[PDB]
């Protein structure tokens, strides 16, 4: 499964720019590990994947698997793009917070896919 | 074209990790962010691109489109994995010497992906 070794890939990725403080570079590996996740079960599936959001393709597997309504909620989360708080403490907790939020969004659909791909 | 968007923000990634001494994670990055470029070719022409690595996506559009022997070169040493030279300058300069490299080809590679999309 190539697409979800590149998955895997992404999310570590997300992890090393969260440690690192970059958020919205955090953010950006997120969508890309949980977009490289949905399309591995595609590609074991031999299926086509249209799109490009991971609303997009969980939407599509819909079809065929049942997908917990959390993790739809969390790939919205995650399609959303990469003000009046207080620069400082306030807007780097509220960034930090985001940050892990969508990283381990990107964590729970990888894992969704893995026991998925595991069974079929 | 999503996929030439997500290639330059993939580019802009790798450039962050260099800037900040992440040399493998800045390989990573340019990996894909080569990948995506030369997918969005196939989209724009409406072909399906088989295959997981830049030299597979180039190799096919090479049936289409002269594709200049550099940028073959180039991308076979993108696709390859991201000790024997000493810790501290000697090896920290070969690494950062070589991420810059695989910056470096994956832009050469966006800006060719470029020329021909404004072409066709």
Known sequence: H???DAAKDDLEHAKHDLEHGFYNWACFS???AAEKAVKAVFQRMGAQAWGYS???FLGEL???FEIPEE???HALEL???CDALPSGSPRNRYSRIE???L???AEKIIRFCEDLLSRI
């Open 62 to 64: 819909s079809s065929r």
């Open 54 to 56: 991971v609303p997009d």
């Open 99 to 101: 940050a892990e939020r």
């Open 2 to 4: 190539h697409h979800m």
């Open 71 to 73: 993790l739809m909620d």
């Open 79 to 81: 399609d959303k793009a």
């Open 103 to 105: 990283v381990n969004y």
């Open 30 to 32: 997120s969508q890309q």
